[PDB]
Structure formats: structure tokens, C-alpha cells
Amino acid sequence: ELRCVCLQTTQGVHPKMISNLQVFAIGPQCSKVEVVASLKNGKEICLDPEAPFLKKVIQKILDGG
Amino acid sequence: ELRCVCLQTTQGVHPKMISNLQVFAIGPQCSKVEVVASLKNGKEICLDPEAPFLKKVIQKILDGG
Amino acid sequence: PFLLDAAPCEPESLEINKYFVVIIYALVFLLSLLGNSLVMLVILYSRVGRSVTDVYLLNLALADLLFALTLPIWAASKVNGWIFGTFLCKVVSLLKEVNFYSGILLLACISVDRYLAIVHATRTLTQKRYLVKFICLSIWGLSLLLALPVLLFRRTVYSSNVSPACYEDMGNNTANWRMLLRILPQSFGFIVPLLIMLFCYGFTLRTLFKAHMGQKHRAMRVIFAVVLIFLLCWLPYNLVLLADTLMRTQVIQETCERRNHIDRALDATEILGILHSCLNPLIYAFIGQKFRHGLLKILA
Amino acid sequence: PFLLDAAPCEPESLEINKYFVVIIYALVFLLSLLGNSLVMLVILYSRVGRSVTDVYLLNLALADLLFALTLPIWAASKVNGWIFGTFLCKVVSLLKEVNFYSGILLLACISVDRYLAIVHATRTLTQKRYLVKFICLSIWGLSLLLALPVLLFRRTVYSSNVSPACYEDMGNNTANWRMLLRILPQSFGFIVPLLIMLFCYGFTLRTLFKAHMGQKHRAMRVIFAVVLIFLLCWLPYNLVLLADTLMRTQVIQETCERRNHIDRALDATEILGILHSCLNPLIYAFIGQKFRHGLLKILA
């Protein structure tokens, strides 16, 4: 059975530590959008989709240069 | 040896077919940002990071409701 | 740090379970095919003594045979996921669900027939047990009606953590709709038939304890065996399903360990329930002297 | 559709290659350890006849022994990736690169010593071959200097497609900096030593063809064997590295098939080059009568 990937969520992480952002959109797997952040440490976190932090992080990552 | 994941890029895909957006930021793996779109068909595409299409797609996906 | 509290719950699967599952599914396929084919052969070879029980057993064996015929593709999907396409997902799910519902409802109808034949033997109500054809036709139609949602709302789902699946796609709120749809199998598949069976068999046993027949004891044992087999086969799966529903509804606290435990329990209980296609011929038909005598005659 | 043109190139790896690689690495470890230890034992047990060649062989064996000692962790990393931490990545990479550079430069210096001893035997320049200690010390210092970048700019890299690696993190433009840093091993590790060896050994062979010594032929054969062994060990790896550099620089068109081919070739050529720690004792030392006689004496 398919299940959501993020049980609890975090809103605070330093952008400089982020390596990957994987976004799962609304679908059969889950009823809510969910963003997974994979860090340079090798760990994984579940960010808050609705927080202002995510948008700024994405904008920064797409404008490295 | 680590290598870039996207050799050639596409700019046109219907948003309704997108299930996952994985963003790799600038790092040892590659010198350029790269966004991978996994579709409902089970296939994968490499979008253009610098195109206007990506930003609108991300905004839509984070505002499903 | 405290970020460890917020972390994805990695789904877990093992190849040993894969191999065991394939072996079990293949063995069940073979056994069910053999038993159902033998039952159908015995019943249809001779038109002498074509009674109501024969008709009920015929329909039941047909349903179990179709279920077994569909099993192998399900086993392959459990092995490597649904690579066979959307159309086969729809058709196979429809056939499987239809046959499952039909088998359950036919068991309930058999219980009703026995109740009418024993308790109301001397009354005028027992003349209403000659409607086997219409009853079975209605049961098949109702089973078809209850499995439309599977055909309509199923497709191939491609995820990242896990292999593809023959899941349901009802829209944005698919999870809750699936939860609601789960009510039908647990109401028309477990509760209603179980209550009917318990009522009918309990009154049957009450009548049989008051009689002086020598063969009462074996009948009591057979009825108890049937009820216990049905419970053992179906109760665990529905309990696990109810637990999953509660966990999704936050009545029970949600954690990764519980998720993995429930997934394993679902797999195991589905395997256990699938055994109803192999044991029904033994419990309901082969335990009767008439069927065994007919089989021995046919082997000539 | 046409979208198939734009698709990620999935990296590919196989477990059979993993198992083969582990076996090869362990065998090489054992052989190199044995040979280097025997050489060191023979040289150090008796201080009689401590010549320049003995010193050069001592340093070379030390370098090869350290390389072999570092090998196993590299094999485990190739198996499951770098799980041992950043500090070990830095230290092991430093030690490995230092010993590789030292071995190459010591081979070149040995060639120079032979050239001075044969061609300039009767001249006054051959008195400059008694500076083995200072030359070897300078070689070790230069090797240490050339491997600082590895210690400074390496760490653990965690990716999604592939397991962790002991890679380099020089910043945003890490790829091009790594490409530039690759120039040092291909200049101070392949080209300069190869040219020096070819020059020295060619003039040595020219002198040896003009002489009337009975044992000239075996010397010719040994020199040819040394050159061919060095080429076979090192040329493929540098050719593959050059091809990868060109492919990254778009001189050669880039495709997934080429990527996979080059990765496999890199693995194979690294394995092949790693054999220099096992064959050096045979080629340079054990092929001499003095070493064999000393070993037989020591076994007493």
C-alpha cells in the first residue's frame, strides 16, 4: 500500500547544507504536497510545503550563478 | 567518477503529467543546476533550469489546493 | 540534533519474502485448480442427483477457479511490480474482486440453504430453497456491481521509493475515497455473511442437539470446522485493514515501525485468505459421501 | 515521442564486477606485501654490499608496501562506498597518491643511475651517483608536495544515483579544477618519467649493442621488459583519463554509452596499474643474482 513519505515536518534548515530537493505532488501516494531535502551530511529531512522558507530556498538554488 | 545527470534538456512538458521534480544544486557532481521531472508515464525528462516554465510549474505544484 | 524527529520513513521489503510468496502462490494455484476441476468434473459428468447443493458447489468452484487463474499475475506483480500494463490491471482486479465477493456470498447462501433444510424441514418455507438458479444469478450480478469501482478507478502508479503498482487513481483526495470504498468488502464481504452464517449455523446446532440421530456429532463438527476456517481465513485481513484505516485516520498514532508491521501483516493475511480457494472443495464438497462415491465411479 | 532524446543517463554498476574486484585487490595486497617484505628483509639483514641500487630498491619497496597497505580500504569503498568518514578519506588518499608518485619518480631515478653507470662509466660524471640519500629525500618531499591538493580538497560526497564517494570538493566549479589538477599525475607521473626512461635506456642499449660482453643480451631483454611493463601498467589508465577529459571538454561527443564504457575502462585500468606493487620486486630486484643469493643465505 502506498503511503505518505513525511510523517512530521520541519521548517528550519540552513540553505547552504541542502543538496537535493525532491517534490512529490498531490496524488494517490498522499493527499498533501511533500518536499524532501537531502543534505550534504547524507541525511534527509521533510520540509514544510506551505512555509515561506521553501520558495526562497528554491529560488536561491536555481540562481547559484 | 561523478558526472552530470542531464546531457540534453527539454523546455516543453504539460504540467498535468508531472509527478516528481528533483533538483540537483551546483556541486561536485555537476557545474550546473539540473532539474529532473518524473512523469506519471514512468519516464524521466531533464528540464531547463533557466526557462520560465520551471518556476510556474513549481508554483503550481505547491498550490494544488 | 532534533531534526532526527523529522525524517522520511523508508519503505522496506525483502527478497526472501518475495521467494516465499511466489512459492506459496504457485502451490495454491496448483491445488485450487486441481480441486475445483475435480469438483466440476464430478458434478457435471452425471446429471443424476443434481440437487441444490450441487449447483451451489458448481458456482463456488467456478469462482475459486477463476481466482486461482488470476493469482499468478498477482504473484509476478508482488515480485517485480505491475509491468503488464493498465488494461490487464483493470481486468485482473475486476475478475479477482468479483470472484471473491461471489465466493463469500455463495458460502452465506449455502448456510441459508442448510438452515432452511434442517430447522424448517417440516414447515412450508423449505419449498423456497428450489430457487438456486435465480439466487446464484443475482449473487453474480451483485458481485459484478460491487466490483465496478475497481475497473473504473484503477491504473498503473509509478513511484520513486517503490516499484509500480496496480493502484487506484480517483483524484486529488484518492486516499479518503479508497478508505470509504474499503467499507464494501468489510460489510458485504465479512460482517453480513459472518452474521448470517453464525445465526443460521447456531440455530442449526440448537436443533441438532435436541435430536436423536446417530450422525449428529459429525454434522456439529463439520459446522464448527466451516465457521473456524472462515474466521481463520478472513478475520485477520479485515482486522489489519481496520488498523490501517485507523492509523490513517489518526485514531492510532502513526509511526514508521507500525507502517512496516502493518504492511507485512497485510501481505501475510492476504496470503492466508487466498487459501480459501484450496480448502473449500475439501470442507464443503469432498467431506460428503456422495461426492467421494461419484469420484471413485468416475475414475473408472 | 521526441522527448526520448532528452533523458537522464542512468549510471550502471554490477555486483559481479564488485566480487571480481575484491578478489583481485586482496590477491594483490597479499602478493605485494610478501614481495616488499622479502626485499626489505634481504636488503636490511646484511649491511655488506650496501650499494646505491639497494637504497633505491629499499625506498621503492617501502612505497609499494604502503600502497598495498592502503589498498583494502579502497576495495571496501569500491564495494559499498566510503562509509569510513572524511578523515580516513583524506589520509588514505594522501598516502596512496604520495606512494604512487614516489614509486614512479624512483623508477626514473633508477633509470638515470643505470645510464650514468653504463654510458658515462669511464667519465667523471659517474661520481654524481653517490647522492642517493639526498635524491631520495628530495623525491619523497616532492611527492608529499604534489599530494597536498588531495588532502586539502577531498571529503565525503553523498549522491542519489550512486553510493558515497571519497571525492573532491573545491567549490562551485569543482569539475574544471579537478580536470586541471589531473594534469599533475599525467605530467609528473607519466610523461616526464617515461621520456627520461626512454632516453636513458635507449642510450644504454646503444652502448650495450657496441660492446663484446657475453651477458649483453640478458641486459637488453631486462631493459625492454621493464619499459614494456611500465607501459602496459600505466599507459591505458592515462589514455582513458585523457578520453574522459576530452569528453567533458566536448572535444569528443558525449553520450551515455561512452560514459559507461569510460567508467568501466577506468576501473579496469586502475586495477591493471595497481599491479605495479607486485611486479616491481620481480623485475628490478629478484632478477639479480645478488638478491637471490642473499635470500637463500637468509633462509638459513
- Nominal resolution in Å? 3.1
Query: Beta strands of D75-169 (E only): which ranges?
Result: 154-157, 165-168
The answer to whether B11 faces chain C, any CB pair under 8 Å, is: no
Say how many C-beta atoms besides its own lie within 10 A of residue C94's C-beta: 19
DSSP string, D9-29: ------HHHHHHHHHHHHHHH
DSSP string, D200-220: HHHHHHHHHHSS--TTHHHHH
Is residue C129 a contact partner of residue C113, using CB atoms and an 8 Å limit? yes
Which pairing describes strands B18-24 and A18-24: parallel, antiparallel, or unpaired? antiparallel
- CATH code, A1-65: 2.40.50.40
Is residue D109 a contact partner of residue D139, using CB atoms and an 8 Å limit? yes
Which residues are bridge partners to C157 per DSSP?
Answer: C165
Please tell me whether residue C69 adopts helix, strand or coil conformation: helix
Residues 6+ apart with CB under 8 A from C229: C279, C283
Can you tell me the distance from the alpha carbon of A56 to that of B62, in angstroms, rounded to the nearest whole number?
13
User: In Å, how far are A63, C81, C244, C255, C261 from C264, measured between CA atoms?
Assistant: 44, 16, 12, 15, 5
Can you tell me the distance from the alpha carbon of C62 to that of C51, in angstroms, rounded to the nearest whole number?
17
Residue D160 and residue B22: Cβ atoms within 8 Å?
Answer: yes
The answer to whether A42 faces chain C, any CB pair under 8 Å, is: no
3-state helix, strand, coil in chain C (%, to 5): 75, 5, 20
Say how many C-beta atoms besides its own lie within 10 A of residue D233's C-beta: 17
**Sign for the pseudo-dihedral over CA of D284, D287, D293, D298:** positive
Contacts B23 to A, Cβ<8 Å = 20-23, 58, 61-62
Task: Give the cell for residue C247.
Answer: 492509523
Task: Give the cell for residue C147.
Answer: 466490483
Can you tell me the distance from the alpha carbon of C135 to that of D207, in angstroms, rounded to the nearest whole number?
110
Can you tell me the distance from the alpha carbon of D241 to that of D247, in angstroms, rounded to the nearest whole number?
10
Can you tell me the distance from the alpha carbon of D242 to that of D263, in angstroms, rounded to the nearest whole number?
13
Can you tell me the distance from the alpha carbon of D106 to that of D109, in angstroms, rounded to the nearest whole number?
5
Task: Give the cell for residue D74.
Answer: 579502497
User: In Å, how far are B60, C45, C295 from C49, measured between CA atoms?
Assistant: 69, 11, 14
Q: How many degrees, rounded to 5, is the angle at CA D295 between CA D292 and CA D297?
A: 110
Contacts D164 to A, Cβ<8 Å = 42
Of B22, B28, B21, B23, give the one whose Cα is nearest residue B4.
Answer: B28
In A, minimum Cα distance to B64 occurs at A26
User: In Å, how far are B28, D78, D101, D281 from D177, measured between CA atoms?
Assistant: 10, 24, 20, 36
Contacts B35 to D, Cβ<8 Å = none
Residue B49 and residue A26: Cβ atoms within 8 Å?
Answer: no
Of D106, D132, D105, give the one whose Cα is nearest residue D190.
Answer: D105
In chain D, the N- to C-terminal Cα span, in Å, equals 78
Residues 6+ apart with CB under 8 A from C207: C118, C119
Spell D155-188 as b/e; 16+ CB within 10 A means b: bbbbbeeeebbbbbebeeebbeebeeeeeebbeb
Phi/psi region, residue D184 (left: phi>0; alpha: psi -120 to 50; beta: rest), is: alpha
Query: Beta strands of chain C (E only): which ranges?
Result: 154-157, 165-168
In the numeric block, the cell 579544477 is attached to: D177
Helix (H) or strand (E) holding B22: strand B18-24
Can you tell me the distance from the alpha carbon of C223 to that of C203, in angstroms, rounded to the nearest whole number?
11
Experimental method: cryo-EM
Contacts B64 to A, Cβ<8 Å = 25-26, 33
In A, minimum Cα distance to D86 occurs at A41
Task: Give the cell for residue C36.
Answer: 475445483
Residue D158 and residue A38: Cβ atoms within 8 Å?
Answer: yes
Q: Tell me which chains share at least 3 CB pairs under 8 Å with chain A.
A: B, C, D
All domains of chain D in start order, with CATH? 14-298 (1.20.1070.10)
> Which residues precede chain breaks (C–N over 2.5 Å) in chain B?
none
Count how many residues are written for chain D. 300
Q: Alpha-carbon Rg of chain D, whole angstroms?
A: 22
Q: Most distant CA pair in chain D: distance in Å?
A: 79
> Exposed (0-12), middle (13-18) or buried (19+): which is C46, by Cβ within 10 Å?
exposed
Q: Tell me which chains share at least 3 CB pairs under 8 Å with chain C.
A: A, B
Residue C160 and residue B20: Cβ atoms within 8 Å?
Answer: yes
Can you tell me the distance from the alpha carbon of C83 to that of D177, in angstroms, rounded to the nearest whole number?
44
Task: Give the cell for residue D30.
Answer: 597479499
Is residue C6 a contact partner of residue A46, using CB atoms and an 8 Å limit? yes
User: In Å, how far are A42, D76, D269 from D82, measured between CA atoms?
Assistant: 12, 8, 21
Helix (H) or strand (E) holding C59: helix C52-80
